Amino acid sequence: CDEHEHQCGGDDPQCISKLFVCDGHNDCRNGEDEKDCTLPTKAGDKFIGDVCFDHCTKRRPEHMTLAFESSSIAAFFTPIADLHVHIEIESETDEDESEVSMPADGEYSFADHRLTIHPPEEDGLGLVGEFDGYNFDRFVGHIVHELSEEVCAEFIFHRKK
């Protein structure tokens, strides 16, 4: 489907606007746009990310925990769930040994199972993890420059169960 449209799949495809996925109205013939609206990263949940390509983070850490503090959905706009998250980090050098727990806002779009976590520090670096669609216990987390949308760090996040 086009750039800003959601595919309903099935043996008979139909493109509808992403702004319609999980909105409360049955926009797709088959209904996909409304039958799979479960929020993965919900309050209380924790996700552990294993680095594998880091060209920007200030700590170039081995891991990176992602704790979800709160999550609320606006009663009239179901397509987007707003989140509050603490990004924890365990660094350790020669001259010192730091720990961090930067807090950031963010939303999760049922439209494409992609949670965007707004930049925590004023260094223009934000996290963007897009979900499998069917998994929800593992998502690739790309650290990017919000403005540009440049990828410069990939972490595989696993739901800490």
């Binding site: 702004l19 409360g24 009239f76 706009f77 987007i80």
Partner: protein, 145 residues
């Protein structure tokens, strides 16, 4: 929390450019906005009985919606030309006075716009700024504050 001044205008005027978009994105952008509005105050559906407000997907209404955003465009697109904006707002003011539209609805419609715009722009979007300007624009249509 902030007033729709010179800069905050330029910002909204620019961001609106991206959120508004064109073609289908538009036909939906408006769609989304109205759905969000009506969802908030179902009471208001009664005012658009003339333009099939019952079915948000009816061409008549689609037109209406796409037609409304149109004005909002002119409004925003001229937040840097008080002279002209003044006029457009005044013009709108007229097309609306007479209809028992409570400040209650405008409020919802603003919220709608804001939520949708935010959904559309992803990350680069100043809330306060829009709030401030959408407000100034609405005031110009009601006459109130």
């Amino acid at each position: 929390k902030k007033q729709c001044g010179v800069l905050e205008g330029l910002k909204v005027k620019s961001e609106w450019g991206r959120a508004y978009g064109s073609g289908h994105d538009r036909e939906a952008f408006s769609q989304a906005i109205w759905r969000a509005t009506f969802a908030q105050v179902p009471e208001s559906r009664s005012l658009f009985k003339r333009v099939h407000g019952d079915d948000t997907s009816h061409p008549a209404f689609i037109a209406h919606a796409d037609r409304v955003l149109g004005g909002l465009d002119i409004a925003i697109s001229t937040l840097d030309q008080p002279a002209t904006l003044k006029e457009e707002l005044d013009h709108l003011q007229v097309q609306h006075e007479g209809r028992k539209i409570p400040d209650n609805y405008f409020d919802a419609f603003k919220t709608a716009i804001l939520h949708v715009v935010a959904a559309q722009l992803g990350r680069c979007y100043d809330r306060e700024a829009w709030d401030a300007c959408i407000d100034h624009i609405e005031d110009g249509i009601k006459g109130h504050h």
